[PDB]
Amino acid sequence: SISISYSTTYSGWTVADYLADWSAYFGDVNHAPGSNTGGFNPGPFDGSQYALKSTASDAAFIAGGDLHYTLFSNPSHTLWGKLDSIALGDTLTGGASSGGYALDSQEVSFSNLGLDSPIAQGRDGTVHKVVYGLMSGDSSALQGQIDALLKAVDPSLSINSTFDQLAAAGVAHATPAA
């Protein structure tokens, strides 16, 4: 089952509102900005983490699992593999040469996502869509996966539940405010 960690600052917020405010704070890598590419750990093009900071703000996210980028190989420009976790917050630190990426202010994380996208699906894979959406101001793909994992625990839950309601259902725990 999905596991959620949230700063106690967000206990009374809904998941959907948190994600919408985070996304607006991150911005969109396209309609506004050499080059802030993000990074894989260990990298250069695969790793157990892919981390990206916004060019417009201090917002950042870290995707965790077993992730691969095809570059020009067939199918080109595809992020694929296992996506176990998404951590969201402010101010990326660390890297491959440091024991891994971390967030200075980790706000919310979603773990045991159980997403697995094989290379054959290319850019149509769910992993690709989740991660790309997070940098382009549209977390709807992530929200859709979270909502389905929550409903598999209890059909009354949804991305419109508050973090406190999710803690009552056993899948989320609060952490000290940063």
Short mmCIF file of N, CA, C and O in Angstrom, two decimals, residues 5-66:
data_model
loop_
_atom_site.label_atom_id
_atom_site.label_comp_id
_atom_site.label_asym_id
_atom_site.label_seq_id
_atom_site.Cartn_x
_atom_site.Cartn_y
_atom_site.Cartn_z
N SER A 5 4.22 10.66 3.60
CA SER A 5 4.81 11.44 4.67
C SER A 5 4.54 12.90 4.37
O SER A 5 4.76 13.35 3.24
N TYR A 6 4.07 13.65 5.36
CA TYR A 6 3.77 15.07 5.15
C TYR A 6 4.25 15.89 6.34
O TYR A 6 4.13 15.48 7.49
N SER A 7 4.81 17.07 6.07
CA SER A 7 5.05 17.99 7.15
C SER A 7 3.74 18.31 7.85
O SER A 7 2.70 18.50 7.21
N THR A 8 3.79 18.46 9.15
CA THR A 8 2.56 18.81 9.88
C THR A 8 1.97 20.16 9.44
O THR A 8 0.78 20.42 9.62
N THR A 9 2.77 21.01 8.81
CA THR A 9 2.24 22.24 8.22
C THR A 9 1.05 22.00 7.30
O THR A 9 0.11 22.81 7.27
N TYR A 10 1.04 20.87 6.60
CA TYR A 10 0.03 20.57 5.59
C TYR A 10 -1.05 19.61 6.08
O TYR A 10 -1.84 19.13 5.27
N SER A 11 -1.16 19.38 7.38
CA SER A 11 -2.07 18.35 7.87
C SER A 11 -3.51 18.62 7.47
O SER A 11 -4.26 17.69 7.18
N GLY A 12 -3.92 19.88 7.44
CA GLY A 12 -5.29 20.22 7.11
C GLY A 12 -5.56 20.48 5.64
O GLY A 12 -6.69 20.80 5.28
N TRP A 13 -4.55 20.40 4.79
CA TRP A 13 -4.74 20.55 3.37
C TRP A 13 -5.15 19.24 2.71
O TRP A 13 -4.80 18.15 3.19
N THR A 14 -5.84 19.36 1.56
CA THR A 14 -6.08 18.21 0.70
C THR A 14 -4.87 17.93 -0.19
O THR A 14 -4.05 18.80 -0.48
N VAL A 15 -4.78 16.68 -0.64
CA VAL A 15 -3.66 16.31 -1.48
C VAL A 15 -3.70 17.10 -2.78
O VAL A 15 -2.66 17.53 -3.29
N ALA A 16 -4.91 17.29 -3.33
CA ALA A 16 -5.06 17.95 -4.61
C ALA A 16 -4.66 19.42 -4.50
O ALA A 16 -3.99 19.94 -5.39
N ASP A 17 -5.04 20.07 -3.40
CA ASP A 17 -4.68 21.48 -3.23
C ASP A 17 -3.19 21.64 -2.97
O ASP A 17 -2.56 22.56 -3.51
N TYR A 18 -2.60 20.79 -2.14
CA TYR A 18 -1.15 20.82 -1.97
C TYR A 18 -0.47 20.69 -3.33
O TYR A 18 0.47 21.43 -3.64
N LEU A 19 -0.89 19.72 -4.13
CA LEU A 19 -0.19 19.47 -5.39
C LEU A 19 -0.40 20.62 -6.36
O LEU A 19 0.52 20.99 -7.09
N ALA A 20 -1.58 21.23 -6.35
CA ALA A 20 -1.82 22.37 -7.23
C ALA A 20 -0.97 23.57 -6.82
O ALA A 20 -0.44 24.29 -7.68
N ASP A 21 -0.82 23.82 -5.52
CA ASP A 21 -0.02 24.96 -5.08
C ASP A 21 1.47 24.71 -5.31
O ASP A 21 2.21 25.61 -5.73
N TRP A 22 1.93 23.50 -5.04
CA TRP A 22 3.30 23.13 -5.38
C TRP A 22 3.58 23.31 -6.87
O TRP A 22 4.57 23.93 -7.27
N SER A 23 2.69 22.80 -7.73
CA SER A 23 2.91 22.90 -9.17
C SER A 23 2.99 24.35 -9.63
O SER A 23 3.83 24.70 -10.48
N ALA A 24 2.11 25.21 -9.11
CA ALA A 24 2.16 26.62 -9.47
C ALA A 24 3.44 27.27 -8.96
O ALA A 24 4.01 28.12 -9.63
N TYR A 25 3.93 26.83 -7.80
CA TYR A 25 5.17 27.37 -7.28
C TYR A 25 6.37 26.90 -8.10
O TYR A 25 7.31 27.67 -8.33
N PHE A 26 6.35 25.64 -8.57
CA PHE A 26 7.41 25.12 -9.45
C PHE A 26 7.42 25.85 -10.79
O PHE A 26 8.48 26.19 -11.32
N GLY A 27 6.25 26.02 -11.39
CA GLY A 27 6.15 26.59 -12.71
C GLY A 27 6.08 25.51 -13.78
O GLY A 27 5.79 24.35 -13.52
N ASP A 28 6.38 25.93 -14.99
CA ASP A 28 6.30 25.13 -16.21
C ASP A 28 7.63 25.29 -16.94
O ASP A 28 8.01 26.42 -17.26
N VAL A 29 8.34 24.19 -17.18
CA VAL A 29 9.63 24.26 -17.86
C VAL A 29 9.54 24.82 -19.28
O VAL A 29 10.56 25.21 -19.84
N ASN A 30 8.34 24.87 -19.87
CA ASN A 30 8.17 25.29 -21.26
C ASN A 30 7.80 26.77 -21.40
O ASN A 30 8.65 27.58 -21.80
N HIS A 31 6.55 27.12 -21.09
CA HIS A 31 6.00 28.45 -21.38
C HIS A 31 6.77 29.57 -20.67
O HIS A 31 6.46 30.75 -20.87
N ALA A 32 7.78 29.21 -19.87
CA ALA A 32 8.75 30.19 -19.36
C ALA A 32 9.97 29.44 -18.84
O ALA A 32 9.82 28.34 -18.29
N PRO A 33 11.20 29.99 -19.01
CA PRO A 33 12.37 29.45 -18.31
C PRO A 33 12.91 30.37 -17.21
O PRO A 33 14.05 30.85 -17.31
N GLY A 34 25.03 25.76 -19.89
CA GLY A 34 23.66 26.10 -20.21
C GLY A 34 22.63 25.07 -19.78
O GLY A 34 22.90 23.87 -19.79
N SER A 35 21.45 25.56 -19.38
CA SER A 35 20.23 24.76 -19.18
C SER A 35 20.16 23.97 -17.88
O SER A 35 21.08 23.22 -17.51
N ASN A 36 19.02 24.10 -17.19
CA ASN A 36 18.74 23.35 -15.97
C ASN A 36 18.06 22.04 -16.35
O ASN A 36 16.85 21.99 -16.59
N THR A 37 18.84 20.97 -16.41
CA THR A 37 18.35 19.69 -16.88
C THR A 37 17.82 18.78 -15.77
O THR A 37 17.04 17.86 -16.06
N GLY A 38 18.21 19.02 -14.51
CA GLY A 38 18.05 18.02 -13.47
C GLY A 38 19.22 17.06 -13.51
O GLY A 38 20.19 17.26 -14.25
N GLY A 39 19.12 15.98 -12.72
CA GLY A 39 20.18 15.00 -12.68
C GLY A 39 19.73 13.65 -12.19
O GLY A 39 18.82 13.53 -11.37
N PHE A 40 20.40 12.62 -12.70
CA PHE A 40 20.23 11.25 -12.24
C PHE A 40 21.31 10.91 -11.22
O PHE A 40 22.45 11.35 -11.32
N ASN A 41 20.94 10.09 -10.25
CA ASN A 41 21.90 9.59 -9.28
C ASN A 41 21.88 8.08 -9.39
O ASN A 41 20.84 7.48 -9.10
N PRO A 42 22.97 7.41 -9.81
CA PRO A 42 24.31 7.90 -10.15
C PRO A 42 24.44 8.64 -11.48
O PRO A 42 25.34 9.47 -11.63
N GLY A 43 23.58 8.36 -12.46
CA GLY A 43 23.70 9.01 -13.74
C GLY A 43 24.79 8.40 -14.61
O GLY A 43 25.38 7.38 -14.26
N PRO A 44 25.07 9.00 -15.78
CA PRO A 44 24.48 10.26 -16.28
C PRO A 44 23.02 10.16 -16.75
O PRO A 44 22.32 11.16 -16.66
N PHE A 45 22.57 9.00 -17.21
CA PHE A 45 21.25 8.87 -17.80
C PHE A 45 20.35 7.83 -17.14
O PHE A 45 19.27 7.58 -17.67
N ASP A 46 20.79 7.19 -16.06
CA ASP A 46 19.98 6.24 -15.32
C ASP A 46 20.30 6.42 -13.85
O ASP A 46 21.40 6.86 -13.51
N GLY A 47 19.42 5.94 -12.99
CA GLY A 47 19.77 5.93 -11.59
C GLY A 47 18.61 5.53 -10.70
O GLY A 47 17.49 5.32 -11.16
N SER A 48 18.92 5.44 -9.40
CA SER A 48 17.88 5.23 -8.40
C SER A 48 17.13 6.52 -8.03
O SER A 48 16.07 6.45 -7.41
N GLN A 49 17.63 7.69 -8.44
CA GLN A 49 16.91 8.95 -8.28
C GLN A 49 17.05 9.78 -9.54
O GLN A 49 18.08 9.73 -10.22
N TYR A 50 15.99 10.53 -9.86
CA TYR A 50 16.05 11.66 -10.78
C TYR A 50 15.50 12.87 -10.04
O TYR A 50 14.39 12.82 -9.50
N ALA A 51 16.28 13.95 -10.00
CA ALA A 51 15.92 15.12 -9.22
C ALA A 51 15.92 16.34 -10.12
O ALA A 51 16.79 16.46 -10.98
N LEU A 52 14.94 17.22 -9.93
CA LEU A 52 14.92 18.48 -10.68
C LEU A 52 14.44 19.64 -9.80
O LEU A 52 13.47 19.51 -9.05
N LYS A 53 15.15 20.76 -9.90
CA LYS A 53 14.78 22.04 -9.32
C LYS A 53 14.19 22.95 -10.39
O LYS A 53 14.61 22.93 -11.55
N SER A 54 13.23 23.75 -9.97
CA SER A 54 12.60 24.73 -10.85
C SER A 54 13.63 25.80 -11.25
O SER A 54 14.48 26.19 -10.45
N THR A 55 13.53 26.29 -12.48
CA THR A 55 14.30 27.50 -12.83
C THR A 55 13.66 28.77 -12.30
O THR A 55 14.35 29.77 -12.14
N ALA A 56 12.36 28.75 -12.02
CA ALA A 56 11.66 29.95 -11.56
C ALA A 56 11.65 30.12 -10.05
O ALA A 56 11.37 31.23 -9.58
N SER A 57 11.90 29.07 -9.26
CA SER A 57 11.72 29.15 -7.82
C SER A 57 12.62 28.13 -7.13
O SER A 57 13.45 27.48 -7.77
N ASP A 58 12.43 27.97 -5.82
CA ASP A 58 13.15 26.96 -5.05
C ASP A 58 12.45 25.62 -5.03
O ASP A 58 12.94 24.73 -4.35
N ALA A 59 11.33 25.49 -5.71
CA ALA A 59 10.59 24.23 -5.74
C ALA A 59 11.44 23.13 -6.38
O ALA A 59 12.19 23.38 -7.32
N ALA A 60 11.29 21.90 -5.88
CA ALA A 60 12.08 20.81 -6.40
C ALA A 60 11.33 19.50 -6.12
O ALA A 60 10.46 19.43 -5.24
N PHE A 61 11.68 18.47 -6.88
CA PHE A 61 11.13 17.15 -6.62
C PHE A 61 12.20 16.10 -6.89
O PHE A 61 13.16 16.34 -7.62
N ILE A 62 12.05 14.95 -6.24
CA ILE A 62 12.97 13.83 -6.40
C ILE A 62 12.13 12.60 -6.69
O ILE A 62 11.23 12.27 -5.90
N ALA A 63 12.35 11.99 -7.85
CA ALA A 63 11.71 10.73 -8.22
C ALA A 63 12.66 9.60 -7.87
O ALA A 63 13.85 9.66 -8.17
N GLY A 64 12.13 8.56 -7.25
CA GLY A 64 12.96 7.46 -6.79
C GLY A 64 12.44 6.13 -7.30
O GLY A 64 11.23 5.93 -7.42
N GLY A 65 13.37 5.24 -7.63
CA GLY A 65 13.08 3.87 -8.01
C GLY A 65 14.23 3.29 -8.80
O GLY A 65 15.35 3.19 -8.32
N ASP A 66 13.95 2.94 -10.05
CA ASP A 66 14.96 2.42 -10.96
C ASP A 66 14.64 3.03 -12.33
O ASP A 66 13.82 2.50 -13.07
#
